């Protein structure tokens, strides 16, 4: 899974968290815009063969399964040091 | 009987309406049906009207306005003790491994006061590593705060498991790890190579993912620390590895500001300086026994003026400084002699023959990296029969600081190796005074104490 | 003549260069830290004018 | 809209837009007093939107072609400012005019290093 | 008397100004900042023996008395110029 | 008649029956355990409801305390009754002698004079110091403003211009002290009372030991002393202990007053609090007033709104830069940032602004090589720099000087500089009829020829 500008994602949720009038941040963002990329990219992961016998009722026993995850983030000048990324 | 009612929702934080004259108290944890599973929330503020604010301890998704709420009239209380022990547990000290019920005796509250003035000791003591380098240039106290510093690739959980089976075997002792905001394939990767090593028995392991809400990952760190105050109350000297004090610091922004109070310089809390002093108070050696911990920090910007380190700085005791660069030498422990310190390093705390001892290796390595210059830039004829002596004997100061460790053992294919601090003092002693100068520098090389190098020596 | 001279000269750069090579890295921590107080400044002016906007 | 009526048509026009910078601008003085609460350097939260909402419609479809040519306003020549920074990535070709050129008396003043096209 | 890091009590003031929601000036200190300061060490003062007698109801005559202050300031990177030092 | 309905630090809000509602800017009075209190009006809120500052501490005031209505502003004593002894914001006697024999009290709070009513005037005022007078010298009757950060000289420079001009001058003097150090009072009062020269001199003092309310008046209470010395027809100087606290004490109630914050979190009111009180400092068609004013600047940020606001009003202004006293060259006037409105070849003549435009355009230029000295080292620079460099570095130290009341520190006797001995000194200097002596020789004489017998010494 390629997630493309997941910096747009936190723009969108900021937008959504200020008509809503939650407490704002640095930099505007909302006290749990931390709390949606980490739970977001967190999914990404490699299962063992014990989940996806679980998972499936044992109709697929031999096989782990995985989600790699490359998203994207866009920095202004090279600051590697705001706060989304 | 539950006794309260939702009264808002607004993500992670909860409103609960209870009876006027039933208003929990402050950090009181609550508990709900989300449907088919409970969920906790614990107690941040009253306010009026018998209305209460609440973050909850797990996905608010799925609360409606109306649920019942029933008040456990006490925090958070997790299980401790030897039960503990080769278990992982999640925040609310329930058992994230698949490997059924802990076998508790008690459970204990996680907030706490600190000892107060007349329990704590009444003397100041090293602790013991075993580890040359630490043990030398950068000693522990018992009760010390201990800063990681070094990146990756750099022998950083190696060093941990080290620790963990010396206080284990060499001393007595036991061992928490606190996973404040780990990664989830890390903290798996973690638990595994503490199974191959046979560490696993020595230390229990509390666990808060990042994917946790914000208060799982701040609260986390308080029932590591609580499950140490009961090894340390049975009279044991105990070691809490903190995975991140920066995300311990994050996890206080997010929840204040979830809160909404009004932020503070840089944007941290108004409460920062407080919530450390909460947790690193409770660290310290009592009479009956103490808490030893390392801590890895995390600089926000490579700025050391930013509150988060200004503040972390303060209670620190000792600084571990990894380095890639040495690591490149085949040196390991991959440690810093030069910019690993220690407060303890003094006179009056570790004695005149240990302060002269390691301000001699501190000079003899700092002139040695100036003399690496010169032999870049005009080579070895430059160099004087005193700096060439010099030279000849940092490069088996240098060697002597490495050590095999017993969970390395897979590596090197050579049995570990513990050394008293009276041997590695005599050996570096010995060095600098120039006895023991006709041996092959790789006589010293991954040997363990200077009795063993010349045993090394009369086969190399 | 000459060519102790040229020796004297190439000698004479590397003493130079080498102080330089110093003096310039003072001038780095100096801006460094500089740098440090207006990031710091720069976030808590501009989360001032944000909470104070509630209003 | 009188660009998307002779776009409709069938005709292929070109639009020339003077500033849509204050477009923005003009967005962030009504924002405060319609109760929003300010983002970023005092740019409403919707920014991104509205943005996205005008820019959207200047395209050409199957019936049609619209060419345009967007002056951009850079506040004091940081390219990082919010308003800047997001109409960038709705563009297809982008010329960046830079000051610092410009000081030197060399006009057109395009960065080479800067400019750019798809 | 020694006051150790007067630095902590700018500190401890500031979170108690902050939860009172009391605006912020420069950094994040309250504008009274130099007023807590200031009452504190002006305090500290040699005082005449006219004062002396007054303040002992004429018990103590013809002595000077006096509190001498050390303040301990903590300041980032030696820097000199920060607004609490 | 009022009663007290709030207490929130300073700011005590007093509730009265609606046919009776103070002004603005009435006194009030209340009586708080053993000792008597005054509020000052400051706004009028709704319902009779009126929101006052408490000139003295507020701790121990209770709600529903009844509250005495005076008919009238603050009012202090002026006229000569008041010289030669030490008043209150209240215009209170503060030295333990008797009552003031005061003939009348005036209003703290005024109008500023009509523009029909000002008066010019390009009399030069001669100082003692070096710098001062070569570059940013004063008028009589004009305004001049120390600007530095802590630990600077101010006050030391001050005291300079207080022993040079107001004892060489023969009128009568206003000394007002707001928000400095008590023992900086006390140890003024004594050496004017050891030279017998307190009887020309009028102090209140509002030192930082007081609460808000006190700083923030005690500057006005200054001026209308000095405003019934001017009216009276006399030639008056005003001396300002620190501006920068007024300014302050706004901040620090201005909150409690209910008014959101500016800027730096600065009250909003901040340049019209600034230029009301400002602009009472004026020489008239009636009477003159020389005025100096140290001005604190925080954070040595010469940017803030507080600094920034205050330049304006003034007509010679004087930086000091922190930079220059770590060198320990005193004092640490910079002469790049230091300016006046009497540096103009009509007034000063020609001479005089040759040199010091000539001074300034050297001292710019070695600002200019310094980047690169630092990075090359000075053997890079041209032969004709390297004389710049060493002309701009012996113009720094010349422009050192021993002050009298500045002995104490460096032990060495202080020095009194005639204006021609200044420029005839760095005219010199520039054209290189000193270019053999080294730069030791200029650090800390009076005049060139004492760094010439210095030279003979090294
Ligand atoms: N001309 C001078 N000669 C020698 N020392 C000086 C001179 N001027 C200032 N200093 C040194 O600096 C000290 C402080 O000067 P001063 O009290 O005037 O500072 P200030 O600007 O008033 O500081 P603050 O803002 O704290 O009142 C003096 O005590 C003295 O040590
Ligand atoms: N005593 C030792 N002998 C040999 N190799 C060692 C020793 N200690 C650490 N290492 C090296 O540490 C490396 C791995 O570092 P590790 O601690 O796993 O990194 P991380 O920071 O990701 O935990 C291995 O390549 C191993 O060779
Ligand atoms: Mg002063």
């Known amino acids: 899974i390629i997630y493309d500008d997941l910096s747009k994602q936190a723009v969108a949720y900021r937008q959504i968290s200020l008509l809503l009038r939650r407490p704002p941040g640095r930099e505007a963002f909302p006290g749990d815009v931390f709390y949606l990329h980490s739970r977001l990219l967190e999914r990404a992961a490699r299962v063992n063969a014990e989940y996806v016998e679980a998972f499936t009722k044992g109709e697929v026993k031999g096989k782990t399964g995985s989600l790699t995850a490359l998203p994207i983030i866009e920095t202004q000048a090279g600051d590697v040091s705001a706060f989304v990324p | 009987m539950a006794t309260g009612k939702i009264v808002q929702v607004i993500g992670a934080v909860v409103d609960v309406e209870f009876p006027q004259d039933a208003v929990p108290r402050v950090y009181d944890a609550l508990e709900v049906q989300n449907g088919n599973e409970r969920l906790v929330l614990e107690v941040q503020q009253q306010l009026g009207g018998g209305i209460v604010r609440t973050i909850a301890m797990g996905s608010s998704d799925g609360l409606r306005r109306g649920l019942d709420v029933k008040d456990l009239e006490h925090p958070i209380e997790v299980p401790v003790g030897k039960a503990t022990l080769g278990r992982i547990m999640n925040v609310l000290g329930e058992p994230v491994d698949m490997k059924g019920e802990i076998g508790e005796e008690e459970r204990w509250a996680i907030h706490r006061a600190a000892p107060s003035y007349e329990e704590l000791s009444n003397s100041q003591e090293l602790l013991e590593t075993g580890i040359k380098v630490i043990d030398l240039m950068a000693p522990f106290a018992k009760g010390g705060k201990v800063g990681l510093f070094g990146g990756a690739g750099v022998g950083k959980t190696v060093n941990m498991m080290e620790l963990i089976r010396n206080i284990a075997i060499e001393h007595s002792g036991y061992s928490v790890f606190a996973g404040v905001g780990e990664r989830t394939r890390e903290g798996n990767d973690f638990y595994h190579e503490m199974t191959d090593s046979n560490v696993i028995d020595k230390v229990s392991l509390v666990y808060g993912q990042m994917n946790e809400p914000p208060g799982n990952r701040l609260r986390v760190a308080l029932t590591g620390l609580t499950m140490a105050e009961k090894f340390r109350d049975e009279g044991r000297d105990v070691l809490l590895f903190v995975d991140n004090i920066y995300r311990y610091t994050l996890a206080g922004t997010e929840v204040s500001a979830l809160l909404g109070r009004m932020p503070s310089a840089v944007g941290y809390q108004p409460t920062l300086a407080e919530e450390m002093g909460v947790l690193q108070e409770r660290i310290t050696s009592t009479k009956t026994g103490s808490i030893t911990s390392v801590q890895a920090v995390y600089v926000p910007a490579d700025d050391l003026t930013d509150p988060s380190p200004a503040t972390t700085f303060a209670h620190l005791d000792a600084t571990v400084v990894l380095s890639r660069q040495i690591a490149s030498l085949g040196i390991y422990p991959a440690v810093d002699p030069l910019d690993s310190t220690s407060r303890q390093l003094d006179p009056l705390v570790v004695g005149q023959e240990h302060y002269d001892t390691a301000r001699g290796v501190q000079s003899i390595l700092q002139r040695y990296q100036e003399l690496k210059d010169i032999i870049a830039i005009l080579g070895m004829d430059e160099l004087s029969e005193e700096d060439k002596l010099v030279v000849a004997r940092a490069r088996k100061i240098q060697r002597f600081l490495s050590q095999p460790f017993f969970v390395a053992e897979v590596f090197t294919g050579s049995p570990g190796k513990y050394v008293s601090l009276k041997d590695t003092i005599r050996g570096f002693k010995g060095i600098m005074e120039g006895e023991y100068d006709h041996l092959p520098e790789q006589a010293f090389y991954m040997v363990g104490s200077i009795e063993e190098a010349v045993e090394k020596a009369k086969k190399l | ?55």
Not at chain 3, 21 to 35: A, C, F, H, R
């Open chain 3, 1 to 55: 003549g000459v060519v102790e001279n040229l020796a004297s000269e190439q000698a004479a750069r590397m003493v130079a260069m080498k102080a330089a090579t110093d003096n310039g890295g003072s001038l780095i921590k100096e801006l460094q830290l500089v740098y440090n107080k207006a990031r710091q400044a720069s976030i808590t002016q501009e989360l001032t004018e944000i909470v104070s906007g509630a209003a």
